Design a binder for this molecule. Structure first.
Ligand SMILES: N[C@@H](CCC(=O)O)C(=O)O
Ligand SMILES: N[C@@H](CCC(=O)O)C(=O)O
Ligand SMILES: [Cl-]
Ligand SMILES: [Cl-]
Ligand SMILES: [Cl-]
Ligand SMILES: [Cl-]
Ligand SMILES: [K+]
Ligand SMILES: [K+]
Ligand SMILES: [K+]
Ligand SMILES: [K+]
Lengths: 256, 256
């Protein structure tokens, strides 16, 4: 109880959480690597706790349906089926009504991922047409941002996204594949766009950031672990350790 | 320590925290009333704690200067000079890097307060001119939102606000007075606009909400009181007690 391993919910999302490469069949925690796994390992070392990582069954981050029921990792935390959600889980006002978060470990904002070609320059350019289809990950923070916005441009965008079946994708990977195979722009969080555009040289960020917010480790509301994790994060940041950790996982061969 | 009274920092802001009317000279906690004081009293009753309310000396909510130093209630918490900030303190990503917050007790967004007269309809209308001056409370969340925005309209607005000495006001009260005496629009949080426009019938909200976020009780990072306060808030909300509390302090004679 005071000594038990913490249950960690997560999902696969490069370069935050990935299946590490091996010839063996792997099991348990050893299956996973990435920026969020490195962060978890360092926190566990600093704070003297152990854990068991489990993939969220529905593969979702989490949003509310019309009855107010949650899904994804957010629901796992609400139900106390996990102690921590270690993932690029966006800290948002709607989620803070239901779960808690550590202090942010990374800053990001919503922006646009699109193929180099048609020289659109902002969300305003997308909103005023439909030839270039656009969308977001279903039941994530970006979708919820658009759904809740009262800014005219973004209201128009939500009207389109929410009317078009194909527009909301299962996960980043599906969305990225869609930008590569169709005339489709993905509304995506900016540090992920940074990672993707360094590796897929035909993709680019369109325009700037629409907002500026954070990823945090999610916990059930009132968790006894959340504060020590926050203080440890703060201290890692004071020493630039998270910047270094980001460089490790974002580092790579650029583009021509 | 386990029994000591909590130090509460606050500032005067109608109808959240006000000096109550009396013929006597009042002292101590008895000086204060309002929505946030009612919230504090209910939490203290539920949770079995006592407190001493102190007004933040600089009268500010809190923002960072160029060296990264904070002021206002945020600085009081960082310094552990207060245990709680009980006020309409906006929960923001930049603040979450330095302090913690309870779950939100109220939802709001940035909007525009302006005199009925010139029929402007949105921030876009303000941004494209300077005849109608506009601004925000200095060293509050709204100012910081504009300062950090990369949305073109809001960048233009920040360029203007930050160049014009008179534009950033000391507090809501100064800003409201300015809308009443000059051709000036105040960027203000929406539930306060709601309160003001019910009482000053010549003022109105212009356009909709630019964002949607929360007020929370601020605490130093890692506070031992923050979780129980969060759970108590949650339970007050499940029973609609905060909606009722808002109706109490926002209730009043409408306008013609
Ligand atoms: N990080 C997001 C998922 C990705 C997105 O919504 O763009 C979340 O926590 O919901
Ligand atoms: N509630 C704001 C102050 C008012 C404003 O910035 O509009 C804050 O916590 O900074
Ligand atoms: Cl698993
Ligand atoms: Cl860092
Ligand atoms: Cl005082
Ligand atoms: Cl309520
Ligand atoms: K253990
Ligand atoms: K393998
Ligand atoms: K006491
Ligand atoms: K008096």
């Amino acid at each position: 109880g005071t000594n038990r391993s913490l249950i960690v919910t997560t999902l696969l999302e490069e370069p935050f959480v990935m299946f590490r490469k091996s010839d063996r069949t792997l099991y348990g925690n050893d299956r996973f690597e990435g920026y969020c796994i490195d962060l978890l390992k360092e926190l566990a070392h600093i704070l003297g706790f152990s854990y068991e990582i489990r993939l969220v069954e529905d593969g979702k981050y989490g949003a509310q349906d019309d009855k107010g029921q949650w899904n994804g990792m957010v629901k796992e935390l609400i139900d106390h089926k996990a102690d921590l959600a270690v993932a690029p889980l966006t800290i948002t006002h709607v989620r803070e009504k239901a779960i808690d978060f550590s202090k942010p470990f990374m800053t990001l904002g919503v922006s646009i991922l699109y193929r180099k070609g048609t020289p659109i320059d902002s969300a305003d350019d997308l909103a005023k047409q439909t030839k270039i289809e656009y969308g977001a990950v279903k039941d994530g923070a970006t979708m919820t941002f658009f759904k809740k916005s009262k800014i005219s441009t973004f209201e128009k965008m939500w009207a389109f996204m929410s009317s078009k079946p194909s527009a909301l994708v299962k996960n980043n990977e599906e969305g990225i594949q869609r930008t590569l195979t169709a005339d489709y722009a993905l509304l995506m969080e900016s540090t992920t766009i940074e990672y993707i555009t360094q590796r897929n040289c035909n993709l680019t960020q369109i325009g700037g950031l629409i907002d500026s917010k954070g990823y945090g480790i999610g916990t059930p509301m009132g968790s006894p672990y959340r504060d020590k994790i926050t203080i440890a994060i703060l201290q890692l940041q004071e020493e630039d350790k998270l910047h270094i950790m980001k460089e490790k996982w974002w580092r790579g061969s650029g583009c021509p």
